[PDB]
Write a protein that binds this ligand. Sequence first.
Ligand SMILES: C[C@@H](O)[C@H](N)C(=O)NS(=O)(=O)OC[C@H]1O[C@@H](n2cnc3c(N)ncnc32)[C@H](O)[C@@H]1O
Ligand SMILES: C[C@@H](O)[C@H](N)C(=O)NS(=O)(=O)OC[C@H]1O[C@@H](n2cnc3c(N)ncnc32)[C@H](O)[C@@H]1O
Ligand SMILES: [Zn+2]
Ligand SMILES: [Zn+2]
Lengths: 418, 417
Amino acid sequence: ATMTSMVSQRQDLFMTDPLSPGSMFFLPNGAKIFNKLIEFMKLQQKFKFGFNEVVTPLIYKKTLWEKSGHWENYADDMFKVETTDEEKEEYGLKPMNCPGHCLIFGKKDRSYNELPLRFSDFSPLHRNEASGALSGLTRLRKFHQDDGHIFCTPSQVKSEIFNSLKLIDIVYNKIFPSNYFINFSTRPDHFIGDLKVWNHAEQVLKEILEESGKPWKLNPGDGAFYGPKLDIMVTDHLRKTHQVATIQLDFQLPERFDLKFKDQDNSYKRPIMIHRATFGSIERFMALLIDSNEGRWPFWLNPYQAVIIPVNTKNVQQLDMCTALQKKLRNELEADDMEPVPLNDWHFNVDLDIRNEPVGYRIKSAILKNYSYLIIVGDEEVQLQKYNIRERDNRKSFEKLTMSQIWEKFIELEKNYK
Amino acid sequence: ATMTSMVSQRQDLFMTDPLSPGSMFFLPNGAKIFNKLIEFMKLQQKFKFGFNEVVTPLIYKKTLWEKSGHWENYADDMFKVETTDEEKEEYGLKPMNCPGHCLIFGKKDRSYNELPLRFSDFSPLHRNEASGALSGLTRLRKFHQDDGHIFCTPSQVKSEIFNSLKLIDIVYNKIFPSNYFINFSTRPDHFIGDLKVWNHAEQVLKEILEESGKPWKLNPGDGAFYGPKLDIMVTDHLRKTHQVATIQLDFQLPERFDLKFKDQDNSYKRPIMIHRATFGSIERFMALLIDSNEGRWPFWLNPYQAVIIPVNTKNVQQLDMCTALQKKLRNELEADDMEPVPLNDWHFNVDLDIRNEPVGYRIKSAILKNYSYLIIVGDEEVQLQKYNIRERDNKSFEKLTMSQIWEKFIELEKNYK
RNA sequence: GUUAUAUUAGCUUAAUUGGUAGAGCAUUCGUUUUGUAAUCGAAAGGUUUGGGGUUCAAAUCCCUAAUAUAACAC
RNA sequence: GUUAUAUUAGCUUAAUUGGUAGAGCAUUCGUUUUGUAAUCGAAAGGUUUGGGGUUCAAAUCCCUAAUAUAACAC
Ligand SMILES: C[C@@H](O)[C@H](N)C(=O)NS(=O)(=O)OC[C@H]1O[C@@H](n2cnc3c(N)ncnc32)[C@H](O)[C@@H]1O
Ligand SMILES: C[C@@H](O)[C@H](N)C(=O)NS(=O)(=O)OC[C@H]1O[C@@H](n2cnc3c(N)ncnc32)[C@H](O)[C@@H]1O
Ligand SMILES: [Zn+2]
Ligand SMILES: [Zn+2]
């Protein structure tokens, strides 16, 4: 939070305003990061773990929330929506995507052949959290979940949760590095449904925990009102734990919505529903990212990937060399004709500091902003037609690379999420 | 509407529900189109027209909306938000992004050196439209604008507006094919600001209209309460006109929020604001596409890009050849290892219909869904190790290798075809 | 929400015990043309989060509203 | 919001200005192994958008709520 605010000020990441407490503004550099993470998650979800993104309403009539049980469970924690006409039924601004995905499931007849049916959803969610509980980006009033719900059969539940934990291991152990433990969170005192169903639901998660081999801890009575959950817990540099990813086993909402599919014996069965998020919310995940990296973004995430600095800022040969590298790496098009920007090209975040200042000043400035690479161009470089390029960390080990070597180096960096 | 509904049912695009009137559900196939359009627009805005995307709140306190003028003026159209507390100040769910973008501009000291300053915003908007004016995807209560606001100087206004017209032309004249005319929508009965400022704002748009050479007509009293505008009008197949893209010249909101920047003379000046959108709303734009194409999407947009049909659904050599092409074209990874999906690969929407049914039935099914391509595999194809591939909009067949189909689809997607 | 503590220019901050709102960084202009962590100079930016009061005088004391941070509550 | 019309199985629809809901597509299983616009068969899916009223009897008539389509209003 204090760390978040320092990095945000240095890098122009975010802003807040009392005219909308607990909602973030992502400034252009903040949104660059936000979007890259979403792009990353969407790729894994659509093209590896078999998810299908939907786009759902944000407001729903009171009746819907009464059906799902939320209007009950979270009555104060829900923002209410009204029209100028006092006769119409009131609305709720959504704090969860799941009743909407239940409406989708049950709008048409479903066949066992389309299960597991996996829906992802990146809608903004609103929760009227207690003002005293709000905190930077970790606990907000408006936030974005990398949300998904799976509809499946009893025999599918375990592999679906193991797949969900695979994606969690890819995020927290491989791409964004022991790294977490699981809270097994059981039946709360306010719950819906039969104690026998709840007991069976807890039984499943217990056996999954055992087979997974992963470290875990009982977290009594902190389950969702509709189901027990596996809560993935990360520790920040002050030894504080934070719930991010989560897998929730839900036998209750399919019952509230009377969800049905037809199986091979030509009869109707009730699906089981799995709630799941891997980032948790994009905002909280970003806060923990910053807490750990202190502004030192990996190359592929960095809103400041390289800066180019000419020793002599009014020298034509240096300038022309700097500009040409910038045009190459940004890979943009001019606004004055009609050729459109193609899909799936590379574009890198490369700036050109030609302020009339000593080189050491501009370098100092770029180090404070945590540029991944520093590219200096002087008369030596103009002769060689190579650029002098420095990584953020290794101040000593320079390289002299051509235009195309830097291009290829950067592409290789993004391919490998490095 | 009619047409939208039929096509939506055939391709499982969208869904509605009385529990949220005037909001769309995009089913997986609908959402694929939605996201591809946004993807297209973001590339143009970021790598050609110098926009920077922002993500902003959805709800703001009454006070903000009173300062912007929306509270008095767009009083009917605004959903109110409240909490259980009731001593707290009321919120409005946003019908526009503009005041959020003014808060961002005004939040920190600004220099003339960062102008033109261009924010793009794709946030969901809500307006409480009259129930009797609601219609399919053209008029909704919730919708997404490809919104943008430009902050600039007086000498920059014309070139910034010409650049917006350039993006409009790429969209309506080249990628998604006079294609439109412009409504010059002037000062409404209820407006904010000075008469003298309004007159100057209309003078500027008149001159632009002249210099642009484009067809236009007067649309009296139809401006926004904060500015006159140029409204891009397209005509549907029943000859009814629809407003899509729009360009709005705003002197008033910067005065309301007292925005300023510092110029070369170390002095404070007020920026001018241009409002713009090119699709208008993604929803209304999709609606007009469907009206135009009757569900026959161009390849790069089609949720149904190719279907693969084995003649003999239990013949192992025919299945292997179908399955191998699907894997190539879809280019997906398996969920059992730790290897992540890399950025900027190609992936195509390719299905395998192995239903134990006559070839002609499966082909009729695929034609009804308007697949761009139909790929048949029989014994002939196994011998040749080539696939029989037929276009939707055509008689003529081709026999191509796996690799040729891959490259063909990439060239179609590359050239937005 | 409650308790505590705060809110001073875009950011960070000073104002000896109510008595001069003062700097640094960033910005604008001039100057310097610079080889891997800060050329030099000037200008501008404040009525101290908003609204009331007390006093000859308020950033400082009193009432109120709003946020933020931290704990609790939930 | 007003006016008109409508709401029947996932979808499209039929049903003596009152008489006791039928089918096509899709789905599930069986059958067919199919060469470019629909193999054959069976099963399941309806208490007619919600609520109230009239009647011996309501998909049908009346009132009302919700939504959709169209036009107007804005
Ligand atoms: C996973 C969803 O489908 C499920 N219905 C759900 O909402 N679970 S949740 O309430 O526990 O939210 C999941 C994660 O969102 C994040 N989250 C929850 N509330 C907030 C908040 N107020 N601000 C920021 N992030 C939050 C946490 O990481 C949490 O683990
Ligand atoms: C362009 C924005 O920055 C500006 N503030 C604005 O809101 N202009 S607007 O009101 O005219 O909206 C622009 C476009 O959104 C689309 N739009 C407006 N209202 C709706 C609606 N109720 N449903 C669907 N699309 C809408 C139209 O295409 C319209 O041209
Ligand atoms: Zn959920
Ligand atoms: Zn606007």
